[PDB]
Amino acid sequence: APLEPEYPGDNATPEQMAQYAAELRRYINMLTRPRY
């Protein structure tokens, strides 16, 4: 209930996407956790 990232929808501009990807990356990080 990272509620989630947010994604515009496509491509906001030639980077957003980048940004955006960074946001979920964090997201996963957070959930995964490994443990172990």
UniProtKB/Swiss-Prot annotation:
The modification Tyrosine amide is found at Y36. It comes from the Eukaryota. Hormone secreted by pancreatic cells that acts as a regulator of pancreatic and gastrointestinal functions probably by signaling through the G protein-coupled receptor NPY4R2. This is Pancreatic polypeptide. It comes from Bos taurus (Bovine). The lineage of its organism: Eukaryota, Metazoa, Chordata, Craniata, Vertebrata. The gene is PPY.
